[PDB]
Design a protein around this ligand. Sequence first.
Ligand SMILES: O=C(O)c1ccc(C(=O)Nc2cc(C3CC3)[nH]n2)cc1
Length: 286
Amino acid sequence: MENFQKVEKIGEGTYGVVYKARNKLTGEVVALKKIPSTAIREISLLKELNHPNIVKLLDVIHTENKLYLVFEFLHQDLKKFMDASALTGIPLPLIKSYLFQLLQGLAFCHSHRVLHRDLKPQNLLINTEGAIKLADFGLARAFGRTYTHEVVTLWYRAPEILLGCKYYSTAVDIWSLGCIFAEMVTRRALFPGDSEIDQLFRIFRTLGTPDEVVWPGVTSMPDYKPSFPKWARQDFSKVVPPLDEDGRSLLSQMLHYDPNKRISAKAALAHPFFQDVTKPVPHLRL
Ligand SMILES: O=C(O)c1ccc(C(=O)Nc2cc(C3CC3)[nH]n2)cc1
């Protein structure tokens, strides 16, 4: 760490503090995250998982029982960009470009059997060129409230996780990305739960209480209760106006209850919603 000069604190992650820093050897500006042997091996496998839509893991430094992850630096996150675009909304061509790029990122990681598990706007990073990249890919499998006691958000958690499936699939990331897509369109979180049951019931109130018809095996899941209230499903036309029919079709497939029915990232890239995809330049002031 004597090779790095901390510039400023940029955030507080799930695992630890994130700093903007300068590498004294190469002159490189980086993001530094301050965090057992199985974790070292798993994190080292992530240095190989390189893609233009994945924030690059430059190095892993293990010194004096402290773990530092050195990443490529990006100047803004999607949470801040959405907050900044609250009054006007992010233009549809830019939402479409970001969704397409994130699906390319997911298709790559999923093809290597790597899941993110905790996608949220805070870990989607953007640059001036129109790119968007996934941060913290693979860290959940390695490390499992934050270190500052901040509550870890449940808003993007898939229903199978909330229902106690411990052997969940790549479909959990498609659910989270569908929640983010809906939030970019409407300018409001889709399911802003503030407890596990509030999160589940917000999902049920919009998509209908799941049953054996729509999700075979649901009633036998660990945290499923026959006493859950039975809510009827809402039309997507009410949930995400003014999204067009192609976008609503794709969103519905990303939010299917059964993880086996939920669209894969690869199949989502072929959806007609992306027929007219482009790569616009966002409005960024840094
Ligand atoms: O509002 C701002 O100034 C601002 C600046 C930087 C960021 C940001 O998280 N950057 C990062 C993080 C990472 C990897 C995952 C460690 N790389 N780059 C977010 C907001």
